[PDB]
Design a protein around this ligand. Structure first.
Ligand SMILES: [K+]
Ligand SMILES: [K+]
Ligand SMILES: [K+]
Ligand SMILES: [Mg+2]
Ligand SMILES: [Mg+2]
Ligand SMILES: [Mg+2]
Lengths: 505, 504, 505, 406
């Protein structure tokens, strides 16, 4: 009855429900792009496949998309067990990079001197003495004493001298320098565009390949989102834009970015360098909160199970990080190198599945529902009122599921905002809405392919019966259990205005 | 916060039309005429209480006839027609005097008054000797016991005991009349819960088709069972409201509530049996537990007492009605105010006025949160639909919650969660329409149209009826948002469907 | 847990503490102005004596004051058991009254609905009022009242409406009939009254109050802050320590309550006239509102009028009256008041005792932990060590279930700040200032005790004297016994900055 | 207002301006056991030094302790700045092995402040450890390590019999499913906060910092959430024992911990703790919560507490004030043990006892006034809460004073 007493009552031997609510996004790479491995990842729990356009050609990514769709459609024979898989495009954005090593990695030692050059005669001759990068205007946005970080901020350089096309720096924090490492300038205002010419081509390619969502990198303000929106244009209007917050400016101007975006990713990787590492959790919990309040999907990302790249078991800190991300209210959790290049992609997915499910059984649901309700504005919207009514009814009868018949996903999205314990089975005939539904916590999208019935009454019963079988087959509920059913009152409607409390036949 | 809620209470902010709390009116010489009854219904009367502590069956049969005559005078228009319930108040185990010589003798402090059981003095009462009808009083009373007469106004202390008499000293003098009620706060009264007279009155109630029985002096669960048994099969649908008016009733309250259909906080006798200082504690306790259980609770007795003789109530009385509603009482009651008073109409209107202002002051969202949180998790589809509807109503500021119901069950389940929006209960059952007044916020509406073959057409007919009712009575306008609770498909006997729908 | 669950927990067989916290204010009149009766009323529980200057001469009230002080000082021989009694001056103010009945015939006449009633200003009819013609003392009534407006007579029981208009007369039609007596109060809710808040008579009364050394003033018909300032100015420098309690008896007073409360030392909810100026069904709204804001501001609030009306004629109160007193205490009123019940009723002693019993039971029904949580929540952050000590003591009293909170004060400031947060334990305020001892009754929970011992030279020794005095008081008054725990508040050297938690010796 | 709204209001650019309340326990090993290193680790923010007795001999561990105390007493020429440092013995693990019995008696001779008893399955095991310590080390604060399923189930009797608890997530994650560890952690920390007893979150909090100069995002999140859960101390195992960046690991925990307690809803936590506060006749307990209440009421710079046993300082800490708790004391084994409790920044008195007891108290108070003004807690004109005894030689603490800073 209090947060304190709630923690005191948390017990290990209380099994979670079988349904796992928070989405799992997996970065696809060499370790996981084969059709067979992709099949295993789907039944391991992968909901969204992220394609990182920071690397690889369009031919490479087109091939990955095909393999993802091949693996996904191999389960399409049984619509009851079929799990939709979303495809996400992660833009390169204004990245700053090395720089090919001379060719053995070079050792940077503390106190030593290192020069940065823009002369393209050194772009493949990087060593202990000289360094190249692809930022043309780095010598007009940086002053003496500035901090320069390379390779995930594991190496830091302090500028001593400045020139027309070079920089003399001292090795503050030193380590082994590799080729093509990420460069960060935490204090500098960056001249690089939000949507470059390459970004435009990649975004247009995403529309061509019918991707479900776009992860826009290094979004600093609302105008950056608007540019990405305009590039997608009319043809890609239904493609959701998830803004990645990875700079100080992004956190600072989060409100205007969230409003413009369809969702948010907490990009803790770059954010942990642009911003002091010990401030990251503040940024995470803040953004997750405002997203939960706004009812827009939020993704927690990067290094959640980092050590699982080499180990079949995560660390205790990693197990904690995933659980806490869920407890904070994250709609999706993400895996990068763990699934892209690691030695245990399948293990990393299964682990996130296990932890997330255990975490959502620890959610102080009734307090959370109260807080989310006092922030909910009063409107004349029948879907909004029905969603709230459905969630509270699900708490009242300890529902096995909340069945939502939706065309666009809106009714299912608004149910998810109030965080029910029971899984939300969203029945749809729209393949895209089924895939995009994975962005919201608790939504278990199921795809109906039966022809639409003239008599609307039995067209509803057809879809409801389908959701019943899905719940039974996937072990959410059984005969004699109670479920909530949401549907419109007549076809062609843009609203769900009817709630049902029905026993499972 | 509740404090800040109090600080923001505004006398100028107009209240929502439609008053939710039921008004129960005791019918007597001042209000039993058809003419007066019509005005009382129009003033806001929802239930008519007939007190069988006085009067004959012939007298009450005529009163019931007058109530239904006045009630059915508005029956020509089912849209504006307001159902009126009939309540039978049992005599119960009452201890009474004692016919005087019908004048009044004066009792003075310090004087000696002799209580006798000799029936030779049952019609010869005066300031010297006093007769009463409790044959075992000398066995349950001791020397030093305090004896109260006439609503606890006259107090006597026992000085000596006889086999059939008591010698007492008047400790609180006053004017003594005939047939006055006697209370023995310290004594263990052994009178039967249901007497032979009660049996004949209860059987009479069944014949007269009364909607509810106010069982007097209920001490325990078995007392309720006796009343239930007497009503039997023929009266199994009659609601039993247990009146709590003694210490044992408060002590064994939980089991009484479980065995009953509802509760009356009978402050009159209760304020005599226990210290008057404690009545508000018992009242707030009982209303709280009744709200929690979802069972009707009535606050009664002396709420506008001064209005028996004056056209305006006192400041304590105005406060009393308001706080009763704020406590969470489903119904408010008038006794002498409407039974024998000089301003019965003014009393009804005043309660209506105060009640409506009071529910506007209710912290609706906090009250709902507590009721939502205390709600028991069950597999019942109707209960889930009910609380879901109330949630929806707050979310969309619903004009009303329309409920189709046969037994009233679904309508009652909505009421227990205390929505701000009025509950329009559409039924074809006239009895459930009458019994619906026991629950706050339920505006019962009686559909007279025959049952259609097409089930969806039958539902639409009843729903469109409620829509017309709400518009006519000014609950909502065309284009407003209302909640509609019905069944989903024919056969099943539960309300499991909620629709959020615009007013045509 | 919740308020509802707290209601269900209320137990009638659960005895309250011996101490009764809310003050009882008794109006003194013919039924109670004798020395013999006044002694019994003090024993019954009277804390403040109200002298209604709406009636009586200066000689009359002086004798009443003399009688009050005689009865009070009859207990002075034992300073342990001595209970200070305050003297309040209730001003007449802008009252409008009739008008003596003709004398020929009966005392009261019968005004019948629909009949014509002429109101006159001609002093020839000053003592010849009847069914046909009625005199009142408002000389400007014809110039302010409008045709169609309504006039209320005798506690609003009688209502008339103006039909015609003359120079020194008004022709009215009886709307609500009834029995009309002599010198009855008259209300003009829908009119702009010329009468000043402080008339020439009020000034003489106020100055007379300073002369008689009254403790506080109940200013009648206060409409705005400027009225409070006029009262403050009349009391002047000699009466600057006299508390000004503003009585809210009209719509304007309710409307402009905030500026009034700020300028005042306290507030009376004058439901009598207020229940005539505004609709009677709105009174509880104004009552709970004013009490709430007074509790928030930490200023004393009095609920008054008709709390136990029936006890004027009967030895027992009605059920509505028992409820009214209990709810006023639960609302948060510092003081409850009796008028005709003690002034001229048949059972003034029984009425005082009843208010004592009900108030004590009501205090044991207070949900203290919720109330204390809210009073802190709305408490401004200082920047004042006295505030911090008061709060600490109150919560400390909760933690050890303290028998009392002992406060050494001179102005009363310390004790007031403690009562502001509403502890359950009684507050024993030890002082040598007799006036502050009397004024202390305006605050809930403060039991003022007057120390008669001479000021001991050593400040530390002076403290131990006054503290041990409070111990003996608590013992004798039955608040706590040997072995219990109490809280002590003192200063370090001659504001309150010191707190102690000590076992009762 | 609400917790959700509190999250939305969290600010990265709102600088933490207090001290660092939660303790840092560093496992001492080959990468840290030198006097030269230990001085830098104390400066970095180490409050407790852990010695794992699963390895090493009594001779090796004895040499380790002297270096800790040598490094610690190197600052002992300035009591105003002197950071006390406690010593803890972590056993190897039948409640105690024959080796444990010999190692425990060793710790008493070496004058350790704490004992981290391994594999605590029940309260009887805590009794068999308290027994070995005997009257010799009756002031040795026993911290029970919950490492298996039985420890979790029977946690209530263990917590009662113990002076504190360590959440040993390492071996616990092996016994129970790794996804259940966070549940066990939050439960045990919650109950420990309820019972007013120290709780330690340990193992792999900054695991990657053994070989890398900066931690991962998961590790940075783990430390912060540990503090937000309500942990009194966080621990470093291999990060300080055999790691390559032991100094960086300590400075990282100090940094995360400070940002974490600036994120804590300071009002909601206290209201809950105060709501569950047991009703007793204890004057010190009442004074403590009264002081915390007053501290929130005036935004006190600190809460100065004069204690001998540590109890009065502990009782203030159990109700989680935002203001630092400056505990002035003479018993050196109390100032060091004070690190087990969040918020208590201990200060050791070196001044001789005055005859004028009021002047004696006024000296210890002035001592704290100097300390807090120098360590950036409060300045001149600020308001602080002082908790002392009433009349000399009193049984306990019962007096609260609110006084401007000179
Ligand atoms: K990217
Ligand atoms: K009766
Ligand atoms: K007056
Ligand atoms: Mg990145
Ligand atoms: Mg009765
Ligand atoms: Mg007045």
């Amino acid at each position: 009855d209090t947060f304190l007493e709630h923690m005191c009552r948390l017990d290990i031997d209380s099994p979670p429900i079988t349904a796992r609510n928070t989405g799992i996004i997996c970065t696809i790479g060499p370790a996981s792009r084969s059709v067979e491995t992709l099949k295993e990842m789907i039944k391991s729990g992968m909901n969204v496949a992220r394609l990182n356009f920071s690397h690889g050609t369009h031919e490479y990514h087109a091939e990955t998309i095909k393999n993802v769709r091949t693996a996904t459609e191999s389960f399409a024979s049984d619509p009851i067990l079929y799990r939709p898989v979303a495809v996400a495009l992660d833009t390169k954005g204004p990245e700053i990079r090395t720089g090919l090593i001379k060719g053995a990695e070079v050792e940077l030692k503390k106190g030593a001197t290192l020069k940065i050059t823009l002369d393209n005669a050194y772009m493949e001759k990087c060593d202990e003495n000289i360094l190249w990068l692809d930022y043309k205007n780095i010598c007009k946005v940086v002053e003496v004493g500035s901090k320069i970080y390379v390779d995930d901020g594991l190496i830091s350089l302090q500028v001593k001298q400045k020139g027309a096309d070079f920089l003399v720096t001292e090795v503050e924090n030193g380590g082994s320098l590799g080729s093509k490492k990420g460069v960060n300038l935490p204090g500098a205002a960056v001249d690089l565009p939000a949507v470059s010419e390459k970004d435009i081509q990649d975004l247009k390619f995403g529309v061509e390949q019918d991707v479900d969502m776009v992860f826009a990198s290094f979004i600093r303000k609302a105008s950056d989102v608007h540019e990405v929106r305009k590039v997608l244009g009319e043809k890609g209007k239904n493609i959701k834009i998830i803004s990645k917050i990875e700079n100080h400016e992004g956190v600072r101007r989060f409100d205007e970015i969230l409003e413009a975006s369809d969702g948010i990713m907490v990009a803790r990787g770059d954010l942990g360098i642009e911003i002091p590492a010990e401030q990251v959790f503040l940024a995470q919990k803040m953004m997750i909160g405002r997203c939960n309040r706004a009812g827009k999907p939020v993704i927690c990302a990067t290094q959640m199970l980092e050590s699982m790249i080499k180990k079949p078991r995560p660390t205790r800190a990693e197990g904690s990080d995933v659980a806490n991300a869920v407890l904070d209210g994250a709609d999706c959790i993400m895996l990068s190198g763990e699934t892209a290049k690691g030695d245990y992609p399948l293990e990393a997915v299964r682990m996130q599945h296990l932890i997330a499910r255990e975490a959502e059984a620890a959610i102080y649901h009734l307090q959370l529902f109260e807080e989310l309700r006092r922030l909910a504005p009063i409107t004349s919207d029948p879907t909004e009122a029905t969603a709230v009514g459905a969630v509270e009814a699900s708490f009242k009868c300890c529902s096995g599921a909340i069945i939502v018949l939706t065309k666009s996903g809106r009714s299912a999205h608004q149910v998810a905002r109030y965080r029910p314990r029971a899984p939300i089975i969203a029945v749809t005939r729209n393949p895209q809405t089924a895939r995009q539904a994975h962005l919201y916590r608790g939504i278990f999208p199921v795809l109906c392919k039966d022809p639409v019935q003239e008599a609307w009454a039995e067209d509803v019963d057809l879809r409801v019966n389908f959701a019943m079988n899905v719940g039974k087959a996937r072990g959410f509920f059984k005969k004699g259990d109670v479920v909530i059913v949401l549907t419109g009152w007549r076809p062609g409607s843009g609203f769900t205005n009817t709630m049902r409390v029905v026993p499972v036949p």
